[PDB]
Amino acid sequence: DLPPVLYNPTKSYNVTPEQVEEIRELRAKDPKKYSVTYLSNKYNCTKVFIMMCTQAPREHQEQHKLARARTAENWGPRRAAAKLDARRRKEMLHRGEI
RNA sequence: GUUUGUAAUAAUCUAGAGAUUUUAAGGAACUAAGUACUAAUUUUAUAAAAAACUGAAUGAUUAAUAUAUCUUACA
Ligand SMILES: [Mg+2]
Ligand SMILES: [Mg+2]
């Protein structure tokens, strides 16, 4: 037999051309309430696909980048260095260096 | 409280060195309790750098994409 399975995903198509429009009007109506997680669970999709059909307005996106930047300034020199190492190992991996 | 011991003044007595009384007097390094009388008392004194890796469980938020082309829209 073959060795154990580690990653065998299954693609699904649960959204229709009409439901895609509902995802667009909702995301633009209230991006705070109709988050991508809420729309993902509502239409039984992946959080990525929700982002492939529509994007939040530029105003809602800037506050997301700020929220992640404010939590980053709370890191000390020891945690900020470990975070940067984790981001470099990933880039090095895809360059064939790891 | 404890300790030392009956200060001075005054009264009386005394050859006079002294005695008696006021007198358990007057003191005191010490102990205990109480008391803010003195000192803890000058305008952001100093030091302290501060959340690793992998697996598992379980959340939040988000383009967390690519290819073709050079024009597109407005006025
Ligand atoms: Mg005694
Ligand atoms: Mg860690």
PDB file of all heavy atoms in Angstrom, chain A residues 37-52:
ATOM      1  N   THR A  37     -15.513  35.831   7.215  1.00  0.00           N
ATOM      2  CA  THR A  37     -15.845  34.628   7.971  1.00  0.00           C
ATOM      3  C   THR A  37     -17.353  34.426   8.038  1.00  0.00           C
ATOM      4  O   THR A  37     -17.839  33.296   7.919  1.00  0.00           O
ATOM      5  CB  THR A  37     -15.254  34.711   9.378  1.00  0.00           C
ATOM      6  OG1 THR A  37     -13.867  35.058   9.297  1.00  0.00           O
ATOM      7  CG2 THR A  37     -15.397  33.381  10.099  1.00  0.00           C
ATOM      8  N   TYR A  38     -18.108  35.509   8.229  1.00  0.00           N
ATOM      9  CA  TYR A  38     -19.562  35.398   8.250  1.00  0.00           C
ATOM     10  C   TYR A  38     -20.099  34.957   6.894  1.00  0.00           C
ATOM     11  O   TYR A  38     -20.991  34.104   6.819  1.00  0.00           O
ATOM     12  CB  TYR A  38     -20.181  36.733   8.660  1.00  0.00           C
ATOM     13  CG  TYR A  38     -21.691  36.716   8.701  1.00  0.00           C
ATOM     14  CD1 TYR A  38     -22.370  36.275   9.828  1.00  0.00           C
ATOM     15  CD2 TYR A  38     -22.439  37.142   7.612  1.00  0.00           C
ATOM     16  CE1 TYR A  38     -23.749  36.257   9.869  1.00  0.00           C
ATOM     17  CE2 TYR A  38     -23.819  37.129   7.645  1.00  0.00           C
ATOM     18  CZ  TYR A  38     -24.469  36.685   8.775  1.00  0.00           C
ATOM     19  OH  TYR A  38     -25.843  36.669   8.812  1.00  0.00           O
ATOM     20  N   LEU A  39     -19.569  35.527   5.811  1.00  0.00           N
ATOM     21  CA  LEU A  39     -20.022  35.139   4.480  1.00  0.00           C
ATOM     22  C   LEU A  39     -19.533  33.747   4.107  1.00  0.00           C
ATOM     23  O   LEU A  39     -20.225  33.022   3.384  1.00  0.00           O
ATOM     24  CB  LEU A  39     -19.550  36.163   3.448  1.00  0.00           C
ATOM     25  CG  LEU A  39     -20.088  37.581   3.644  1.00  0.00           C
ATOM     26  CD1 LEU A  39     -19.236  38.586   2.891  1.00  0.00           C
ATOM     27  CD2 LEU A  39     -21.536  37.665   3.196  1.00  0.00           C
ATOM     28  N   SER A  40     -18.352  33.356   4.586  1.00  0.00           N
ATOM     29  CA  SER A  40     -17.851  32.012   4.321  1.00  0.00           C
ATOM     30  C   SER A  40     -18.768  30.960   4.932  1.00  0.00           C
ATOM     31  O   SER A  40     -19.153  29.991   4.268  1.00  0.00           O
ATOM     32  CB  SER A  40     -16.431  31.870   4.866  1.00  0.00           C
ATOM     33  OG  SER A  40     -16.073  30.507   5.004  1.00  0.00           O
ATOM     34  N   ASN A  41     -19.129  31.135   6.205  1.00  0.00           N
ATOM     35  CA  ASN A  41     -19.997  30.170   6.869  1.00  0.00           C
ATOM     36  C   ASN A  41     -21.423  30.232   6.338  1.00  0.00           C
ATOM     37  O   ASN A  41     -22.134  29.222   6.359  1.00  0.00           O
ATOM     38  CB  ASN A  41     -19.986  30.408   8.378  1.00  0.00           C
ATOM     39  CG  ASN A  41     -18.619  30.182   8.993  1.00  0.00           C
ATOM     40  OD1 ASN A  41     -17.880  29.289   8.581  1.00  0.00           O
ATOM     41  ND2 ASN A  41     -18.277  30.992   9.987  1.00  0.00           N
ATOM     42  N   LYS A  42     -21.859  31.399   5.860  1.00  0.00           N
ATOM     43  CA  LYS A  42     -23.225  31.525   5.363  1.00  0.00           C
ATOM     44  C   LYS A  42     -23.411  30.770   4.053  1.00  0.00           C
ATOM     45  O   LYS A  42     -24.410  30.063   3.876  1.00  0.00           O
ATOM     46  CB  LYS A  42     -23.581  33.001   5.185  1.00  0.00           C
ATOM     47  CG  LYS A  42     -24.986  33.242   4.658  1.00  0.00           C
ATOM     48  CD  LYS A  42     -25.284  34.725   4.538  1.00  0.00           C
ATOM     49  CE  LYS A  42     -26.673  34.967   3.973  1.00  0.00           C
ATOM     50  NZ  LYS A  42     -27.023  36.414   3.956  1.00  0.00           N
ATOM     51  N   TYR A  43     -22.467  30.906   3.125  1.00  0.00           N
ATOM     52  CA  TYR A  43     -22.564  30.281   1.814  1.00  0.00           C
ATOM     53  C   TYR A  43     -21.741  29.004   1.709  1.00  0.00           C
ATOM     54  O   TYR A  43     -21.624  28.443   0.616  1.00  0.00           O
ATOM     55  CB  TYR A  43     -22.133  31.272   0.732  1.00  0.00           C
ATOM     56  CG  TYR A  43     -22.983  32.520   0.693  1.00  0.00           C
ATOM     57  CD1 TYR A  43     -22.564  33.689   1.311  1.00  0.00           C
ATOM     58  CD2 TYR A  43     -24.210  32.526   0.045  1.00  0.00           C
ATOM     59  CE1 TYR A  43     -23.342  34.829   1.283  1.00  0.00           C
ATOM     60  CE2 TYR A  43     -24.993  33.661   0.010  1.00  0.00           C
ATOM     61  CZ  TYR A  43     -24.555  34.809   0.631  1.00  0.00           C
ATOM     62  OH  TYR A  43     -25.333  35.943   0.597  1.00  0.00           O
ATOM     63  N   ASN A  44     -21.174  28.532   2.818  1.00  0.00           N
ATOM     64  CA  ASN A  44     -20.414  27.285   2.848  1.00  0.00           C
ATOM     65  C   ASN A  44     -19.282  27.321   1.820  1.00  0.00           C
ATOM     66  O   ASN A  44     -19.236  26.540   0.868  1.00  0.00           O
ATOM     67  CB  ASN A  44     -21.337  26.085   2.613  1.00  0.00           C
ATOM     68  CG  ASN A  44     -20.712  24.776   3.046  1.00  0.00           C
ATOM     69  OD1 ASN A  44     -19.754  24.756   3.818  1.00  0.00           O
ATOM     70  ND2 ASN A  44     -21.254  23.670   2.549  1.00  0.00           N
ATOM     71  N   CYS A  45     -18.361  28.256   2.032  1.00  0.00           N
ATOM     72  CA  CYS A  45     -17.222  28.464   1.152  1.00  0.00           C
ATOM     73  C   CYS A  45     -15.963  28.614   1.995  1.00  0.00           C
ATOM     74  O   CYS A  45     -16.007  28.592   3.229  1.00  0.00           O
ATOM     75  CB  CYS A  45     -17.437  29.690   0.257  1.00  0.00           C
ATOM     76  SG  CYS A  45     -18.508  29.367  -1.153  1.00  0.00           S
ATOM     77  N   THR A  46     -14.831  28.765   1.318  1.00  0.00           N
ATOM     78  CA  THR A  46     -13.577  29.075   1.982  1.00  0.00           C
ATOM     79  C   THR A  46     -13.427  30.584   2.111  1.00  0.00           C
ATOM     80  O   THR A  46     -13.922  31.350   1.280  1.00  0.00           O
ATOM     81  CB  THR A  46     -12.390  28.500   1.206  1.00  0.00           C
ATOM     82  OG1 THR A  46     -12.351  29.072  -0.107  1.00  0.00           O
ATOM     83  CG2 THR A  46     -12.506  26.989   1.094  1.00  0.00           C
ATOM     84  N   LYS A  47     -12.739  31.010   3.171  1.00  0.00           N
ATOM     85  CA  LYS A  47     -12.530  32.437   3.383  1.00  0.00           C
ATOM     86  C   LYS A  47     -11.799  33.085   2.216  1.00  0.00           C
ATOM     87  O   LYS A  47     -11.946  34.292   2.001  1.00  0.00           O
ATOM     88  CB  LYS A  47     -11.754  32.668   4.679  1.00  0.00           C
ATOM     89  CG  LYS A  47     -12.536  32.319   5.932  1.00  0.00           C
ATOM     90  CD  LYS A  47     -11.861  32.857   7.179  1.00  0.00           C
ATOM     91  CE  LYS A  47     -10.625  32.055   7.534  1.00  0.00           C
ATOM     92  NZ  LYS A  47     -10.134  32.379   8.900  1.00  0.00           N
ATOM     93  N   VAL A  48     -11.020  32.314   1.458  1.00  0.00           N
ATOM     94  CA  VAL A  48     -10.312  32.875   0.312  1.00  0.00           C
ATOM     95  C   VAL A  48     -11.293  33.193  -0.808  1.00  0.00           C
ATOM     96  O   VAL A  48     -11.273  34.289  -1.379  1.00  0.00           O
ATOM     97  CB  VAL A  48      -9.205  31.911  -0.155  1.00  0.00           C
ATOM     98  CG1 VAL A  48      -8.657  32.322  -1.520  1.00  0.00           C
ATOM     99  CG2 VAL A  48      -8.087  31.856   0.870  1.00  0.00           C
ATOM    100  N   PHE A  49     -12.164  32.238  -1.143  1.00  0.00           N
ATOM    101  CA  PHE A  49     -13.107  32.449  -2.237  1.00  0.00           C
ATOM    102  C   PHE A  49     -13.950  33.698  -2.012  1.00  0.00           C
ATOM    103  O   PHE A  49     -14.219  34.449  -2.955  1.00  0.00           O
ATOM    104  CB  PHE A  49     -14.010  31.230  -2.405  1.00  0.00           C
ATOM    105  CG  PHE A  49     -14.984  31.361  -3.538  1.00  0.00           C
ATOM    106  CD1 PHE A  49     -14.550  31.298  -4.850  1.00  0.00           C
ATOM    107  CD2 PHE A  49     -16.329  31.568  -3.293  1.00  0.00           C
ATOM    108  CE1 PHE A  49     -15.442  31.425  -5.895  1.00  0.00           C
ATOM    109  CE2 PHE A  49     -17.225  31.696  -4.335  1.00  0.00           C
ATOM    110  CZ  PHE A  49     -16.781  31.625  -5.637  1.00  0.00           C
ATOM    111  N   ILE A  50     -14.359  33.949  -0.767  1.00  0.00           N
ATOM    112  CA  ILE A  50     -15.104  35.169  -0.470  1.00  0.00           C
ATOM    113  C   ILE A  50     -14.288  36.394  -0.849  1.00  0.00           C
ATOM    114  O   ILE A  50     -14.844  37.412  -1.278  1.00  0.00           O
ATOM    115  CB  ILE A  50     -15.512  35.195   1.018  1.00  0.00           C
ATOM    116  CG1 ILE A  50     -16.471  34.043   1.336  1.00  0.00           C
ATOM    117  CG2 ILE A  50     -16.138  36.539   1.390  1.00  0.00           C
ATOM    118  CD1 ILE A  50     -17.815  34.119   0.630  1.00  0.00           C
ATOM    119  N   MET A  51     -12.967  36.322  -0.703  1.00  0.00           N
ATOM    120  CA  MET A  51     -12.109  37.441  -1.063  1.00  0.00           C
ATOM    121  C   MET A  51     -11.815  37.489  -2.556  1.00  0.00           C
ATOM    122  O   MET A  51     -11.390  38.536  -3.055  1.00  0.00           O
ATOM    123  CB  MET A  51     -10.799  37.374  -0.277  1.00  0.00           C
ATOM    124  CG  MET A  51     -10.990  37.350   1.232  1.00  0.00           C
ATOM    125  SD  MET A  51      -9.661  36.500   2.096  1.00  0.00           S
ATOM    126  CE  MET A  51      -8.318  37.638   1.801  1.00  0.00           C
ATOM    127  N   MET A  52     -12.029  36.387  -3.276  1.00  0.00           N
ATOM    128  CA  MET A  52     -11.886  36.401  -4.726  1.00  0.00           C
ATOM    129  C   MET A  52     -13.100  36.998  -5.425  1.00  0.00           C
ATOM    130  O   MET A  52     -12.965  37.498  -6.547  1.00  0.00           O
ATOM    131  CB  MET A  52     -11.654  34.979  -5.240  1.00  0.00           C
ATOM    132  CG  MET A  52     -10.569  34.226  -4.495  1.00  0.00           C
ATOM    133  SD  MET A  52      -9.790  32.945  -5.492  1.00  0.00           S
ATOM    134  CE  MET A  52     -11.201  31.919  -5.885  1.00  0.00           C
TER     135      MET A  52
END
